[PDB]
Write a protein that binds this ligand. Structure first.
Ligand SMILES: *[C@H]1O[C@H](CO)[C@@H](O)[C@H](O)[C@H]1NC(C)=O
Ligand SMILES: *[C@H]1O[C@H](CO)[C@@H](O)[C@H](O)[C@H]1NC(C)=O
Ligand SMILES: *[C@H]1O[C@H](CO)[C@@H](O)[C@H](O)[C@H]1NC(C)=O
Length: 421
């Protein structure tokens, strides 16, 4: 049962549609909120936006970083001066199950593999009902941030797994995501210890603490990697997140933006408060016609189960290579002002992933990239065929929120410009 946002404020002109896609036998209720290109939906690609968590709603990217609408105290919509769908029809799915607005009576989803598994089951039901996005030869891609840096590849395989498919995937976008923990994990000390733009935030004492605490942390990532057992992956998580994330947290700096400060407990980004506010409202909860009673951003439970399952420490970075091997154009982009999923570490994981153009990628030199729109160096490229690593200058964990001009700049140009920067 689905309604149109035709009822809510949000994005007028274009033509939005929202609601649910259901799965009988499994009893799973997917929730989405689509928007048609501000230009031509017929030409313009298709996009799957994915937030992390794990267990966080995707609406958040919608009203907070790259959607059309925004949240004012007023709990009144706002137009985005640099929206994502400006030149493309976007999809705002609420995965996993029981996230944001989706739901179920009895499931699972205590891991990634099985999540994609449901995601593909929805991509085929959606494409079905709105076949108006393929036939025309409409390039479809997927994007996400943070934990989606786990999800994405895994979902990307899942999908490509079916030759059976009712659709085509063209590329992947991953922003400030967790992908190859084993490698990204050493980038914790460097980035907080004064080596990645902003300056040292931790007493050198604390720094050496991270450097001792490292060896141990890592052998744990390995064991998880090679074993994939709860017995190793679980302590690898707790231990590493301990030794390396907490010291920064103590300082009470924002975790998504080293420049901004945020003390422990409250929000780092309060405005998202208004968001959970606008969502639950009586009129707003109506339109969408969502069958949920109370909407939360994230679901503690889901988070917990992923954590208690080993999740976070599994080498999903492997999937990346297959996809590259299967000639899939990939884009790894990083806000350079974020601590939780640094550009230092996302840089490096890239710099070492194996794939056919393995040596050439590592050869190719870094170049300064010019924002499509604003005409200003906005980051730093490393490109090689369908695999590109970009460093977004003056960016936090949610790059679109911080630099909208540049994001879209980086966006369309990748969406359009021929899978290169
Ligand atoms: C998308 O939208 C605008 C506006 O009507 C258009 O000028 C632009 O050429 C479009 N696509 C790109 C990537 O240039
Ligand atoms: C994907 O588009 C349609 C979907 O089912 C299919 O007919 C076509 O063969 C696929 N594209 C290829 C050739 O990669
Ligand atoms: C990046 O371009 C060159 C890199 O070799 C450098 O001279 C320059 O400082 C950079 N561009 C800027 C910051 O205008």
């Amino acid at each position: 049962k689905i309604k149109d946002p035709k009822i809510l404020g949000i994005d007028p002109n274009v033509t939005q549609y929202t609601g649910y896609l259901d799965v009988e036998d499994e009893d799973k209720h997917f929730f989405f909120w689509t928007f048609e290109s501000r230009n031509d939906p017929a030409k313009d690609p298709v996009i799957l936006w994915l937030n992390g968590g794990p267990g966080c709603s995707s609406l958040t990217g919608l009203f907070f970083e790259l959607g059309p609408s925004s949240i004012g105290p007023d709990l009144k919509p706002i137009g985005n001066p640099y929206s994502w769908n400006s030149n493309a029809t976007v999809i705002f799915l609420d995965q996993p199950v029981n996230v944001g607005f989706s739901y179920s009576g009895s499931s699972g989803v205590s891991n990634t593999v099985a999540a994609g598994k449901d995601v593909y089951n929805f991509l085929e039901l959606f494409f079905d009902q709105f076949p108006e996005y393929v036939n025309k030869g409409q390039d479809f891609h997927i994007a996400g941030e943070s934990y989606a840096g786990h999800y994405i590849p895994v979902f990307a395989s899942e999908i490509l797994s079916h030759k059976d498919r009712n659709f085509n995937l063209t590329s992947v976008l991953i922003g400030n995501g967790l992908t190859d923990p084993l490698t990204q994990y050493n980038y914790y000390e460097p980035m907080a210890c004064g080596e990645g733009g902003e300056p040292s935030v931790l007493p050198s004492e604390e720094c050496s603490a991270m450097e001792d605490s490292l060896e141990r942390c890592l052998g744990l990532i390995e064991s998880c990697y090679d074993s994939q057992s709860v017995w190793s992956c679980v302590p690898a998580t707790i231990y590493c997140n301990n030794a390396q994330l907490a010291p920064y947290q103590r300082t009470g700096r924002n975790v998504y933006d080293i420049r901004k400060d945020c003390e422990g407990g409250n929000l780092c980004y309060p405005t998202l408060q208004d968001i959970d506010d606008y969502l639950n409202q009586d009129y707003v909860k109506e339109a969408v016609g969502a069958e949920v009673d109370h909407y939360e951003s994230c679901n503690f439970d889901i988070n917990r189960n992923f954590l208690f399952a080993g999740d976070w420490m599994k080498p999903y970075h492997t999937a990346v290579t297959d996809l590259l091997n299967q000639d899939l154009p990939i884009l790894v982009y990083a806000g350079d002002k974020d601590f939780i999923c640094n550009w230092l570490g996302n840089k490096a994981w890239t710099d070492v992933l194996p794939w056919k153009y393995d040596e050439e990628f590592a050869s190719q030199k870094v170049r300064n990239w010019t924002a499509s729109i604003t005409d200003e160096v906005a980051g730093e490229v490393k490109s090689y065929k369908h695999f590109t690593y970009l460093r977004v200058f003056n960016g936090g964990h949610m790059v679109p929120f911080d630099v909208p001009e540049n994001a879209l700049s980086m966006v369309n140009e990748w969406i359009h410009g021929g899978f290169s920067l």
